[PDB]
Design a protein around this ligand. Sequence first.
Ligand code: NA
Lengths: 6, 99
Amino acid sequence: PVYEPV
Amino acid sequence: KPLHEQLWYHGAIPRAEVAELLVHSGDFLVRESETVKGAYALSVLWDGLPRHFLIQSLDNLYRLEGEGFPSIPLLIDHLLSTQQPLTKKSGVVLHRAVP
Ligand code: NA
């Protein structure tokens, strides 16, 4: 995982 | 002012250069996302780990979780001035705009 939740 | 004239905006920069620029917890910048077309990311060093938040928008308001702002600079200014967490779950806080 790289980006936080959207 | 233009996004590219903002203190904390670094444009399209490689990950190596983000990791070099974010040195202490609370350091942050805004950059272009490499993998999401046209998107911006808010990158913050937090507890030793780079954290990357895609800057979302809905109904012309930029936001990470709660109700948003008409521009990205207004969102950043709000986060930096209030020191409120970027999201409830993450607890990440902005402290220093990396120039
Ligand atoms: Na997000």
